[PDB]
Scaffold this active site. Structure first.
Site, mmCIF file in Angstrom:
data_model
loop_
_atom_site.group_PDB
_atom_site.id
_atom_site.type_symbol
_atom_site.label_atom_id
_atom_site.label_comp_id
_atom_site.label_asym_id
_atom_site.label_seq_id
_atom_site.Cartn_x
_atom_site.Cartn_y
_atom_site.Cartn_z
ATOM 1 N N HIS A 69 60.010 47.439 38.655
ATOM 2 C CA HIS A 69 60.060 46.008 38.337
ATOM 3 C C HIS A 69 58.603 45.695 38.021
ATOM 4 C CE1 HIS A 69 63.903 45.210 40.779
ATOM 5 N NE2 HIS A 69 64.203 45.399 39.487
ATOM 6 N N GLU A 72 55.679 43.476 39.898
ATOM 7 C CA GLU A 72 55.271 43.830 41.250
ATOM 8 C C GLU A 72 54.015 44.696 41.214
ATOM 9 O OE1 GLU A 72 59.065 45.326 42.825
ATOM 10 O OE2 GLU A 72 59.956 43.508 41.974
ATOM 11 N N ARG A 127 60.123 41.159 34.811
ATOM 12 C CA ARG A 127 60.529 42.256 35.690
ATOM 13 C C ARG A 127 61.426 43.316 35.043
ATOM 14 N NH1 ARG A 127 65.324 41.789 38.593
ATOM 15 N NH2 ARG A 127 64.276 42.182 40.599
ATOM 16 N N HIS A 196 58.663 48.778 45.916
ATOM 17 C CA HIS A 196 58.808 47.434 45.356
ATOM 18 C C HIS A 196 57.984 46.435 46.166
ATOM 19 C CE1 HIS A 196 62.662 48.080 43.051
ATOM 20 N NE2 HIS A 196 62.528 49.246 43.698
ATOM 21 N N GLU A 270 59.539 47.481 50.361
ATOM 22 C CA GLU A 270 59.251 46.191 49.734
ATOM 23 C C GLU A 270 57.915 45.858 50.404
ATOM 24 O OE1 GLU A 270 60.421 44.274 47.496
ATOM 25 O OE2 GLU A 270 62.398 45.120 47.061
#
Length: 305
Positions: A69, A72, A127, A196, A270
């Site tokens: 993505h 990020e 993204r 991510h 994440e």
């Protein structure tokens, strides 16, 4: 810049600078790092993977991808730091040295090159990929909803204009198919990690179904351990659990696919933060984020070896 030792790891870089970095790292550590091109993006940019190996033939491997993505940025920045870290710690850190002496590590720093370029050029928060279709004026597919794992099920959108559009069919995006073909052709990956941001979470399968994975007990304890290791540097708190019970149902995800391929240690990180800055994480937080995340990734690698 001229050496991976003069490269500024504490600031965000463009695609060209990261690609140049790769060539510098390989020239400096030819016996440990090599650059492989596993495909080309929709807009023709090369898709590179760095292979860290001390030898052998198709040794058990660890897969790590970042930046699927594009917005990020903390992930691509962490990927660069990781690449350098691997070359610095081999022969210095007893645990990592043991890992590299028996396993190979494949690192894809910019999994979505076209989107990354776009975030620098036109839209910082883009993204998706940059593939186009005649059926819509909207561009791109959410590459982490394009995998063959509950593809098209609830947790993804069938609208091309949606930020979570899954694409016309599983593996339709060349950025995804390039990884699928590589991993399947290799056939000896033991771990698959996808990085991510943001939320500070460590997740394991599944996201597309409520069914519990048969290896839940083990992955759950490994996640608990990795989270504990990560927190030891700056006190950064992470939550962990399956994707669907921790966040929400999400289909076509990469670790759900990898786990179904038999790759047991499939996790998604994440990174920082929890919302203060979100995707626009300050450059001053790059190094500390990379440092703590490394402790978490190494913990997972240790249980794999």
């Amino acid at each position: 810049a001229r050496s991976t030792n003069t490269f500024n790891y504490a600031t965000y870089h463009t695609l060209d600078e990261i690609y140049d970095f790769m060539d510098l790292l390989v020239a400096e550590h030819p016996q440990l790092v090599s650059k492989l091109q596993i495909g080309r993006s929709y807009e023709g940019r090369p898709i590179y993977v760095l292979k860290f190996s001390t030898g052998g033939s198709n040794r058990p491997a660890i897969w790590i991808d970042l930046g699927i993505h594009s917005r990020e940025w903390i992930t691509q920045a962490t990927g660069v730091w990781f690449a350098k870290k691997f070359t610095e710690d081999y022969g210095q850190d007893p645990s990592f040295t043991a890992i590299l002496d028996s396993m190979d590590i494949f690192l894809e720093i910019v999994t979505n090159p076209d989107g990354f370029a776009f975030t620098h050029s036109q839209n910082r928060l883009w993204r998706k990929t940059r593939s186009v279709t005649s059926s819509s004026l909207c561009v791109g597919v959410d590459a982490n909803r394009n995998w063959d794992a509950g593809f098209g099920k609830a947790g993804a959108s069938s609208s091309p204009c949606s930020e979570t559009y899954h694409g016309k069919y599983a593996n339709s995006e060349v950025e995804v198919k390039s990884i699928v073909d590589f991993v399947k052709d290799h056939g000896n990956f033991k771990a698959f990690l996808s990085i991510h941001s943001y939320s500070q979470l460590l997740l394991y399968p599944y996201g597309y179904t409520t069914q519990s994975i048969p290896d839940k007990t083990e992955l759950n304890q490994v996640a608990k351990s990795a989270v504990a290791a990560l927190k030891s540097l700056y006190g950064t708190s992470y939550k962990y659990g399956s994707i669907i019970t921790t966040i929400y149902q999400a289909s076509g995800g990469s670790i759900d696919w990898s786990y179904n391929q038999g790759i047991k240690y499939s996790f998604t990180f994440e990174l920082r933060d929890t919302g203060r800055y979100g995707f626009l994480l300050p450059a001053s937080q790059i190094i500390p984020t990379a440092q703590e995340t490394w402790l978490g990734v190494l913990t997972i690698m240790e249980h794999t070896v």
